[PDB]
Amino acid sequence: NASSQLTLLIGNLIQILGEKSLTALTNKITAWKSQQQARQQKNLEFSDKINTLLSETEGLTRDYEKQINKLKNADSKIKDLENKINQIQTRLSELDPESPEKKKLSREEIQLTIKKDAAVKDRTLIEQKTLSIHSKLTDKSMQLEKEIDSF
Protein backbone atom coordinates (compact mmCIF):
# COMPACT_ATOMS: atom_id res chain seq x y z
CA ASN A 1 0.00 0.00 0.00
CA ALA A 2 1.88 3.07 -1.33
CA SER A 3 0.18 5.47 1.06
CA SER A 4 1.02 3.53 4.21
CA GLN A 5 4.59 2.97 3.07
CA LEU A 6 4.88 6.70 2.35
CA THR A 7 3.61 7.47 5.86
CA LEU A 8 6.31 5.21 7.27
CA LEU A 9 8.95 6.84 5.10
CA ILE A 10 8.23 10.43 6.02
CA GLY A 11 7.80 9.32 9.63
CA ASN A 12 11.24 7.71 9.49
CA LEU A 13 12.88 10.72 7.81
CA ILE A 14 11.34 13.07 10.38
CA GLN A 15 12.69 10.88 13.23
CA ILE A 16 16.28 11.64 12.34
CA LEU A 17 16.03 14.85 10.31
CA GLY A 18 13.39 16.77 12.27
CA GLU A 19 9.98 17.97 11.02
CA LYS A 20 10.99 21.64 10.65
CA SER A 21 13.38 20.95 7.80
CA LEU A 22 10.80 18.73 6.08
CA THR A 23 7.63 20.76 6.49
CA ALA A 24 7.42 21.34 2.73
CA LEU A 25 7.69 17.67 1.86
CA THR A 26 5.22 16.89 4.66
CA ASN A 27 2.80 19.30 3.07
CA LYS A 28 3.32 17.87 -0.39
CA ILE A 29 2.60 14.40 1.03
CA THR A 30 -0.71 15.60 2.50
CA ALA A 31 -1.74 16.95 -0.93
CA TRP A 32 -0.76 13.69 -2.61
CA LYS A 33 -2.82 11.70 -0.10
CA SER A 34 -5.78 13.97 -0.72
CA GLN A 35 -5.48 13.69 -4.52
CA GLN A 36 -5.19 9.91 -4.26
CA GLN A 37 -8.44 9.80 -2.26
CA ALA A 38 -10.30 12.04 -4.72
CA ARG A 39 -8.98 9.99 -7.67
CA GLN A 40 -10.23 6.84 -5.95
CA GLN A 41 -13.66 8.44 -5.45
CA LYS A 42 -13.87 9.40 -9.15
CA ASN A 43 -12.61 6.03 -10.32
CA LEU A 44 -15.36 4.18 -8.40
CA GLU A 45 -18.07 6.62 -9.44
CA PHE A 46 -17.06 6.48 -13.11
CA SER A 47 -16.92 2.71 -13.07
CA ASP A 48 -20.45 2.40 -11.67
CA LYS A 49 -21.83 4.95 -14.10
CA ILE A 50 -20.14 3.38 -17.12
CA ASN A 51 -21.63 0.01 -16.09
CA THR A 52 -25.06 1.57 -15.83
CA LEU A 53 -24.79 3.45 -19.13
CA LEU A 54 -23.57 0.28 -20.83
CA SER A 55 -26.38 -1.90 -19.50
CA GLU A 56 -28.91 0.85 -20.29
CA THR A 57 -27.52 1.18 -23.80
CA GLU A 58 -27.85 -2.59 -24.36
CA GLY A 59 -31.45 -2.56 -23.19
CA LEU A 60 -32.34 0.33 -25.47
CA THR A 61 -30.55 -1.35 -28.37
CA ARG A 62 -32.72 -4.42 -27.91
CA ASP A 63 -35.80 -2.18 -27.70
CA TYR A 64 -34.81 -0.36 -30.86
CA GLU A 65 -34.38 -3.62 -32.79
CA LYS A 66 -37.64 -5.02 -31.45
CA GLN A 67 -39.48 -1.85 -32.51
CA ILE A 68 -37.82 -1.74 -35.95
CA ASN A 69 -39.05 -5.29 -36.57
CA LYS A 70 -42.51 -4.30 -35.30
CA LEU A 71 -42.52 -1.36 -37.70
CA LYS A 72 -41.73 -3.59 -40.66
CA ASN A 73 -44.63 -5.88 -39.87
CA ALA A 74 -46.75 -2.73 -39.68
CA ASP A 75 -45.72 -1.57 -43.14
CA SER A 76 -46.61 -5.10 -44.26
CA LYS A 77 -50.11 -5.19 -42.85
CA ILE A 78 -50.65 -1.90 -44.69
CA LYS A 79 -49.24 -2.95 -48.03
CA ASP A 80 -51.57 -5.93 -47.74
CA LEU A 81 -54.68 -3.99 -46.85
CA GLU A 82 -53.88 -1.70 -49.77
CA ASN A 83 -53.93 -4.74 -52.03
CA LYS A 84 -57.28 -6.07 -50.83
CA ILE A 85 -58.78 -2.59 -51.34
CA ASN A 86 -57.36 -2.18 -54.85
CA GLN A 87 -58.34 -5.71 -55.76
CA ILE A 88 -61.86 -5.13 -54.52
CA GLN A 89 -61.99 -1.66 -56.07
CA THR A 90 -61.07 -3.08 -59.47
CA ARG A 91 -63.65 -5.84 -58.95
CA LEU A 92 -66.32 -3.26 -58.06
CA SER A 93 -65.65 -1.15 -61.13
CA GLU A 94 -66.21 -4.06 -63.49
CA LEU A 95 -69.40 -4.87 -61.57
CA ASP A 96 -72.71 -5.12 -63.44
CA PRO A 97 -74.07 -1.70 -62.53
CA GLU A 98 -76.88 -3.22 -60.39
CA SER A 99 -75.69 -5.96 -59.33
CA PRO A 100 -76.70 -8.58 -56.77
CA GLU A 101 -73.21 -8.58 -55.14
CA LYS A 102 -72.26 -4.88 -55.33
CA LYS A 103 -73.90 -4.12 -51.98
CA LYS A 104 -71.74 -6.66 -50.13
CA LEU A 105 -68.36 -5.80 -51.72
CA SER A 106 -69.07 -2.14 -50.96
CA ARG A 107 -69.46 -3.11 -47.29
CA GLU A 108 -66.20 -5.06 -47.40
CA GLU A 109 -64.40 -2.09 -48.85
CA ILE A 110 -65.60 0.21 -46.06
CA GLN A 111 -64.30 -2.39 -43.66
CA LEU A 112 -60.87 -2.75 -45.29
CA THR A 113 -60.69 1.01 -45.30
CA ILE A 114 -61.48 1.25 -41.59
CA LYS A 115 -58.78 -1.34 -40.94
CA LYS A 116 -56.20 0.40 -43.09
CA ASP A 117 -56.79 3.80 -41.45
CA ALA A 118 -56.30 2.16 -38.06
CA ALA A 119 -53.13 0.42 -39.27
CA VAL A 120 -51.69 3.68 -40.58
CA LYS A 121 -52.32 5.18 -37.16
CA ASP A 122 -50.74 2.26 -35.38
CA ARG A 123 -47.77 2.43 -37.75
CA THR A 124 -47.02 6.07 -36.95
CA LEU A 125 -47.15 5.20 -33.23
CA ILE A 126 -44.50 2.50 -33.67
CA GLU A 127 -42.37 4.78 -35.85
CA GLN A 128 -42.58 7.39 -33.09
CA LYS A 129 -41.37 4.91 -30.47
CA THR A 130 -38.50 3.89 -32.73
CA LEU A 131 -37.43 7.53 -33.05
CA SER A 132 -37.92 8.09 -29.32
CA ILE A 133 -35.70 5.12 -28.44
CA HIS A 134 -33.09 6.42 -30.88
CA SER A 135 -33.29 9.72 -29.05
CA LYS A 136 -32.80 7.96 -25.72
CA LEU A 137 -29.68 6.27 -27.15
CA THR A 138 -28.41 9.68 -28.13
CA ASP A 139 -29.05 10.81 -24.55
CA LYS A 140 -26.83 7.95 -23.43
CA SER A 141 -24.01 9.25 -25.60
CA MET A 142 -24.48 12.73 -24.10
CA GLN A 143 -24.48 11.36 -20.55
CA LEU A 144 -21.27 9.51 -21.39
CA GLU A 145 -19.54 12.68 -22.62
CA LYS A 146 -20.73 14.49 -19.47
CA GLU A 147 -19.04 11.88 -17.28
CA ILE A 148 -15.82 11.90 -19.31
CA ASP A 149 -15.62 15.70 -19.20
CA SER A 150 -15.96 15.84 -15.44
CA PHE A 151 -13.64 12.94 -14.65
Swiss-Prot record:
Cell location: Secreted; Host membrane; Host cell; Host nucleus
Induction comment from the UniProt entry of this chain: Synthesis of this immunogen is repressed at 30 degrees Celsius and restored at 37 degrees Celsius.
Changes seen on gene knockout: Deletion mutant shows fast constitutive secretion and displays increased adhesion to HeLa cells. Mutant is non-hemolytic in the presence of sheep red blood cell (RBC). Mutant displays normal secretons.
Coiled coil: 31-151
Record family assignment: Belongs to the SctE/SipB/YopB family.
Subunit structure: The core secretion machinery of the T3SS is composed of approximately 20 different proteins, including cytoplasmic components, a base, an export apparatus and a needle. This subunit is involved in the formation of a pore, called the translocon, in host membrane. Interacts with IpaC/SctB. Interacts with the needle tip protein IpaD/SctA. Interacts with the molecular chaperone IpgC, which prevents premature association with IpaC/SctB within the cytoplasm of Shigella cells and protects IpaB/SctE from proteolysis. Interacts with the host protein ICE in the cytoplasm of infected macrophages.
Function: Component of the type III secretion system (T3SS), also called injectisome, which is used to inject bacterial effector proteins into eukaryotic host cells. IpaB/SctE and IpaC/SctB are inserted into the host membrane where they form a pore and allow the translocation of effector proteins into the cytosol of target cells. Interaction with IpaD/SctA at needle tips leads to the formation of the MxiH/SctF-IpaD/SctA-IpaB/SctE ternary complex, which is essential for host cell sensing.
UniProt domain comment: The immediate N-terminus is needed for recognition by the secretion apparatus and chaperone binding. The N-terminal region is necessary for interaction with IpaD/SctA and the sequential maturation of the T3SS needle tip. The C-terminal half is key to the activities needed for formation of an active translocon and possibly for translocation itself. The extreme C-terminus is required for efficient needle tip binding, and its absence also affects regulation of secretion and adhesion to and possibly invasion of host cells.
Designated name of the protein: Type 3 secretion system translocon protein SctE
Organism: Shigella flexneri
Taxonomic lineage of the native organism: Bacteria, Pseudomonadati, Pseudomonadota, Gammaproteobacteria, Enterobacterales
Gene name per UniProt: sctE
